[PDB]
Design a protein around this ligand. Structure first.
Ligand SMILES: NC(=O)c1ccc[n+]([C@@H]2O[C@H](COP(=O)([O-])OP(=O)(O)OC[C@H]3O[C@@H](n4cnc5c(N)ncnc54)[C@H](O)[C@@H]3O)[C@@H](O)[C@H]2O)c1
Ligand SMILES: NC(=O)c1ccc[n+]([C@@H]2O[C@H](COP(=O)([O-])OP(=O)(O)OC[C@H]3O[C@@H](n4cnc5c(N)ncnc54)[C@H](O)[C@@H]3O)[C@@H](O)[C@H]2O)c1
Ligand SMILES: NC(=O)c1ccc[n+]([C@@H]2O[C@H](COP(=O)([O-])OP(=O)(O)OC[C@H]3O[C@@H](n4cnc5c(N)ncnc54)[C@H](O)[C@@H]3O)[C@@H](O)[C@H]2O)c1
Ligand SMILES: NC(=O)c1ccc[n+]([C@@H]2O[C@H](COP(=O)([O-])OP(=O)(O)OC[C@H]3O[C@@H](n4cnc5c(N)ncnc54)[C@H](O)[C@@H]3O)[C@@H](O)[C@H]2O)c1
Ligand SMILES: N#Cc1ccccc1Oc1ccc(Cn2cc(C3CC3)nn2)cc1O
Ligand SMILES: N#Cc1ccccc1Oc1ccc(Cn2cc(C3CC3)nn2)cc1O
Ligand SMILES: N#Cc1ccccc1Oc1ccc(Cn2cc(C3CC3)nn2)cc1O
Ligand SMILES: N#Cc1ccccc1Oc1ccc(Cn2cc(C3CC3)nn2)cc1O
Lengths: 268, 268, 268, 268
């Protein structure tokens, strides 16, 4: 009955109930998966959100910049799921860029220390999570991360575009390592979804040229998309992630699936 | 229980039991679809093959070069599935190129009449089938065709590479038309599968440089693919097609999903 | 002094003085090339235009659909340039699509016969010209054709987009054949230039949705382009073609150079 | 007579006489440019090499990790070329990755601190140099950096592939900033050239699987390239860079020109 019946999947990146990861985790549990959740920094907060999913799931702390957390992680998950059981799926739904790197702030004024921090959390950590978790994954497993098509430059996204270009390259190497375990690694490139991280791109703060540019970009999606795009509904994205976590894309790895209404296939 | 439970899907392109389309049709019926089949030219032949699928399905004649067949097609399908019912899925699994266009024959010696015939069957017919069938498709439906990545040139494939480049462009326009109906249009770019059409690329005929080049290309797939590639098993491809026909890639259109072991993501 | 000093170059595709090919031919002669021109159908017409170039050049008839013209072509050029001399450069600046294939006319209503005619002139003829001319080209030579980026679908361009996707694939195979002669083959993907062929896309005829879509597309170029885009000035395109015809891009073949203000590198 | 007659161009990245930058600087001076050179760390060393170029040129110290050097740089160049003169060209020919990030060392064992250092020097510094130099560039100027196509993963190149993916994204944003000054920004993606940095990829050290993989990759270039590829001759690459620095690619920005024999256009 359930697409992910009987699979065990770690989902990272839940912060609010608008989190792409929250909707992935929801759809996963509806399709019969058993989850382990990771949260960063505001754990009691995340737990209250995570209490609203259709089923219970252990929650564990994971700051991908923290080397001890990364080192304990597989042993912690193993404790959460039972000795002798492994993970079938891993979702990386995580990103960060300091405010200098994005929004109004000129591109050339972002210090390297801030860019470097963004690339660590947004790109490198895809490899670091795979490293920590591949040893406790089953053949036929699936690792999925979240992308925003960075093939072309665009206003405001600035250094996060750079970090996504890195992530895509990183995903291609993760696939070479994951292959040795019989495990696939892919990214889902989503269209714009109203989340907390999307509210932080300007720094919210108001009436600046970059805010207008951002509204114009985001409206372009629904226009260009042959099937339309609803920024208010993360479900089509969540479903696509679940497609990859299942056994129905068994020959796809090192790759990017576009859950964007087909917008990236159309110029106008 | 079934991924395609309760959907009605037309599959074209069955000629033998190695046909990519045969394995799509098989997997579809295992996942609860109800099929309508199309066959070209050797109908009694196709019928004997189609008798070995797990369930029965009406078979109809469709030469995509035949304008009367294309004109009657929707009315014929409607008769096969019941007045008041529509198609949820369409699979285009069809191609052709005259022998001058491919194999040993020099690229520059292919007459336009032969190239033109190949592009008609291999590319144009994706639009012509969509034209004929979109009026009898349901919102939320899916059209899928079969591609072989033509982004780079390669030995022997010659004008069929050209025809696949056309098909990709054609698919992007089909998506704009299909959108009006709430229907997606996508291609699956497969790795090499041993089928009848694959036996015809040299013209089989033997010990020529192009035959060796073709064997070297085909071995490269399994090497470059992080998860490996088995040319003997069309199932992973069939499954991927079924992924697209389902409701689990709801935001993907005008696009290409690579069922090739990840080979196209790796240089070596 | 002259970039193309002492080279001999065939330029096709001059119809008016706005023709991309006219500006290629002009810039070529300013940089010291010696030209041979080809014209289709309105030869006395073309000759009057060609009389306004900075220097004289023989003009020859070439309908790329005409097999006798293609067969005589190398012998005709050889007569025009002297026994014992060869071509160093070839410019394909040629395209056509019947009115059903483009503009207002729905995509699905274009008959195959018309599409096929467009692909013959717009794509296939790049191979047919190379075939006819490679035997009379010098090592270190250059073949260049003209593209309009067809990676994504767009309004109105319709089947000509398909024909350009084909051309790109064709160019990649032409490069494999041309390599044997020490000759490169490339396309220049230009931004929109006001030419005769651009006036014919709607069929000119007025106030239809597709006309507006076309004006919106064309304005997007200058906005997205970091250095701007002037649709009134073919010179930057002509210069780029001359770059490829010279000895300064000696390691580039099977490829596409974008003379579009950088518009294709920017989403918004 | 000279392609770059009367232009003033800064070239970074000369370390030995095999340096891609050395051959760019040579070809530039043959075509009449006047140069300013930058060197990192071994200045007396670089100076002896730079003494063998056809003409003299001031040399200045530039570690792109050093913020004071970056801050003084424009004022230093201005002193070297004369108050009231500006730069017409900038060449970034610079990269670095610590040994953990590349060669034999497993991909997952590269610490972030080392990756981060590589991305700082190899990618970020393209923006930092543009920042420092755009204020002293002339309209119609050109910034060029050096790439190695990272679209697909490959053995050994590991984190430097990631850094090149970043660089490509960075170049697209640099083009948006450079546009405001009438200046283009592009990368040249070169085929493999025997340089010092190429000797350091394994760490030279011997008979390991990755060494063989690297030799197999490098031989693939000359095979796949329609015009061949000579790893011993940086001139075709140098010429391509000079093409971009000239006025003959005036409409190309945010982009990548492939000086790789056409290898990236061919699968086999
Ligand atoms: N919302 C969109 O339009 C959109 C589109 C495409 C891709 N994405 C990507 O989707 C993913 C999820 O973002 P979202 O939009 O759902 O937003 P969000 O704010 O819901 O989620 C971002 C998550 O990153 C986590 N995070 C930040 N730093 C961390 C660290 N050090 N360690 C671990 N977790 C950390 C936060 O805790 C949060 O849970 C990201 O990779 C984002 O770039 C978003
Ligand atoms: N086998 C591979 O390695 C491979 C890989 C990628 C894509 N493909 C594509 O997959 C599709 C199916 O080919 P296959 O390899 O399974 O081979 P096949 O020989 O099994 O199938 C080709 C089908 O095309 C049909 N056909 C030809 N001309 C027709 C016409 N006028 N009208 C209708 N049907 C017509 C034939 O009847 C046959 O059923 C094609 O588009 C092919 O290019 C094949
Ligand atoms: N103008 C643009 O915005 C633009 C942009 C990118 C690419 N292009 C391409 O540039 C090339 C030149 O077009 P243009 O815009 O300068 O227009 P045009 O109308 O100046 O040139 C088109 C040429 O094609 C020729 N032609 C048509 N059918 C022919 C045949 N049977 N044999 C030989 N010649 C034939 C015409 O005689 C004419 O000289 C084409 O390939 C076009 O698709 C145009
Ligand atoms: N050789 C190839 O096959 C090849 C192919 C494509 C691209 N590339 C790229 O070409 C460029 C030049 O490399 P090369 O192969 O000619 O090698 P190289 O070793 O000749 O040049 C690398 C240069 O980087 C400089 N450098 C390193 N760290 C620096 C820093 N902190 N600040 C300033 N300079 C610093 C070194 O001093 C040296 O001059 C690089 O970007 C390289 O990645 C090389
Ligand atoms: N997590 C996270 C995150 C961190 C820094 C920047 C953005 C982040 O999440 C995203 C949120 C939204 C989008 C999509 N998007 C970009 C834009 C405008 C160009 C800024 N609008 N929507 C992409 C994202 O990576
Ligand atoms: N149907 C069909 C068809 C028609 C003409 C040529 C090939 C056809 O089917 C295919 C069969 C196999 C492949 C994959 N492929 C290409 C090659 C060698 C380069 C020729 N080997 N495997 C691609 C196909 O389009
Ligand atoms: N030659 C020729 C030609 C033949 C059919 C269609 C167009 C032709 O020339 C072009 C003329 C202009 C353009 C650029 N373009 C497209 C468009 C709108 C989308 C139709 N506007 N500018 C591209 C071209 O191939
Ligand atoms: N500079 C520099 C540099 C720094 C770290 C790594 C390589 C560097 O220069 C390169 C030297 C050679 C190549 C081309 N290449 C890669 C490879 C094998 C896959 C490692 N062989 N040739 C690409 C380069 O970026």
């Amino acid at each position: 009955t359930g697409l992910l019946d009987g699979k065990r999947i770690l989902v990272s990146g839940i912060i609010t109930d608008s989190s792409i990861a929250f909707h992935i985790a929801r759809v996963a549990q509806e399709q019969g998966a058993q989850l382990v959740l990771t949260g960063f920094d505001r754990l009691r907060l995340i737990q209250r959100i995570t209490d609203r999913l259709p089923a219970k799931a252990p929650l564990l702390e994971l700051d991908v910049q923290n080397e001890e957390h990364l080192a304990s992680l597989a042993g912690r998950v193993t404790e959460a799921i039972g000795a002798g059981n492994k993970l079938d799926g891993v979702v990386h739904s995580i990103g960060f860029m300091p405010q200098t790197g994005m929004g109004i702030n000129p591109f050339f004024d972002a210090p390297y220390a801030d860019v470097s921090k963004g690339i660590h959390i947004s790109a490198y950590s895809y490899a670091s999570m795979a490293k920590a978790l591949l040893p406790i994954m089953n053949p036929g497993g699936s690792i999925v991360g979240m992308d925003f098509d960075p093939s072309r430059a665009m206003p405001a996204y600035n250094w996060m575009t750079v970090a996504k270009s890195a992530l895509e390259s990183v995903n291609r190497f993760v696939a070479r390592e994951a292959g040795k375990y019989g495990v696939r690694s892919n990214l889902v490139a989503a269209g714009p979804i109203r989340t907390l991280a999307m509210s932080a791109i300007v720094g919210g703060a108001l009436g600046e040229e970059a805010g207008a540019q951002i509204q114009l970009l985001e409206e372009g999606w629904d226009q260009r998309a042959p099937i339309g795009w609803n920024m208010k509904d993360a479900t089509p994205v969540a479903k696509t992630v679940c497609a990859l976590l299942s056994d129905w894309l068994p020959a796809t790895t090192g790759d990017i699936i576009y859950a964007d209404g087909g917008a990236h296939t159309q110029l106008l």
